Amino acid sequence: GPAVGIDLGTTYSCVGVFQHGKVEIIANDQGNRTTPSYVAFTDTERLIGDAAKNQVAMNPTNTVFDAKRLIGRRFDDAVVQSDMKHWPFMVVNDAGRPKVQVEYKGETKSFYPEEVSSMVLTKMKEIAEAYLGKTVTNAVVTVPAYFNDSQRQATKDAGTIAGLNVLRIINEPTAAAIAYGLDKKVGAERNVLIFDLGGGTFDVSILTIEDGIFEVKSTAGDTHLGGEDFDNRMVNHFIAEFKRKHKKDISENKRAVRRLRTACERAKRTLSSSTQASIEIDSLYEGIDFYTSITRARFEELNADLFRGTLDPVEKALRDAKLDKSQIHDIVLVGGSTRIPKIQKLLQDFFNGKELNKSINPDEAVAYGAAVQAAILS
Template sequence: MQQKNQVAMNPENTVFDAKRLIGRRYEDEKIQSDLKHWPFKVVNDGEKPKIQVQYKGEVKRFAPEEISSMVLTKMKQTAEAFLGTSVQDAVITVPAYFNDSQRQATKDAGAIAGINVLRIINEPTAAALAYGLDKGLKGERTVLIFDLGGGTFDVSILTIDEGSLFQVKATAGDTHLGGEDFDNRLVNYFSEEFKRK
């Protein structure tokens, strides 16, 4: 909620959607398409996107990995406060469609946050684990995991064995099919309607 209040008062310095930038090149067509929706500035720094903000009167530039590391640092602190002990290791989830570059950039974000990243796993696989789809299983089961989020859409088909062995059979997704994209399309549609009238 704090971010939503911040974006209204200081939009050009409120950063979000680092997941859409991480592990991509500045000239990537998806980044170029997203630029028109972001109130913050994204600049080309050696073919890599950097988020530029004003902080205490200074211009600062952050790589998407640095922004993600800030989120991971906060999550680490929250986990440590809840558990009452330090957290060194973590498994981090990423959208199923993330390529190798995006996965490596996510690992780098974990390292920047001081986390030993044990593994990167697909979000739909994590959902299957979280819902205990492997519990009380007799034989093998094939499941479809459908994840429509705020900014992404993931679908995975998994087979789960009674020994809690997960095997990903197929995966697909879209970085630009989620709640935020629905909002953007509605805004574009209604702005065109108002222009016509």
């Protein structure tokens, strides 16, 4: 091709390419190394990635996201029925198969989850092509270790529809391990723990690797725990603050809340590198600007319980894998949320000081490994 590796994430997607013994994580048109798994429909155009997420606050009903939560599933599934209650866009039943329904160019249209995902993949494909200056066809796409045959098939279909020849569908934790060269043959078997906290899901996977062969020993986590939940805690904190300072409740103004969420998300990222962050929103509500700040300590307290709770699935995974902490040879951080210092501290403390593999941006680790594997398969 060269072939590329793509992490089609629940909230963010990332594409990499292995060239000259090195993996290049490819930045998009806006210079971002990861791209929102968002697609929006308007009276005149279809928006994808950054362009789509950048307008989610004003077009909530026609901006689709979380397509990965529906992919390969049946409409009657309990989880699908539960999730629908939280999404601002409509999900309809087409012969027992879920489809997202939106308005596009003034007409009602519906798309299968794989179609929405094919759009995101098309964007990743184009991002790679812009960088390489060549047509990209072959790719390795990743999926959660718990995905079944249907979910895997639908994900592969998303690739095909996007014009990609999916060389193989591999597990996200395995891709992360490959990124660190943990697939290399060293004689005896090794136990690796993948701690993956993204924007919407938390996955803990214990892999046993021997002779380059991976075995998923156990998996644990929470499909409804991620960075967005941390943003939410910050959002509530600031709604209360605005209310005290202006005796005005912004809760019912959907756009105001979404804009505050965006400001919180960015402030949160800054708190991973600094101990304080500034929030400066213009015309948040009724023309009132909201300029304030938040400390890392404050951010940690607001999420104390959620952070600490990530250790329960780690213990469960170890138990199911029938392994004690000391039997874990490597701990790999995956997901943008693992960049939070308090999380790293909790995990390291739990593992009695053991160092964490975190040199590769956690939110790029899966695509990194996928790119390596893609090169191998080509």
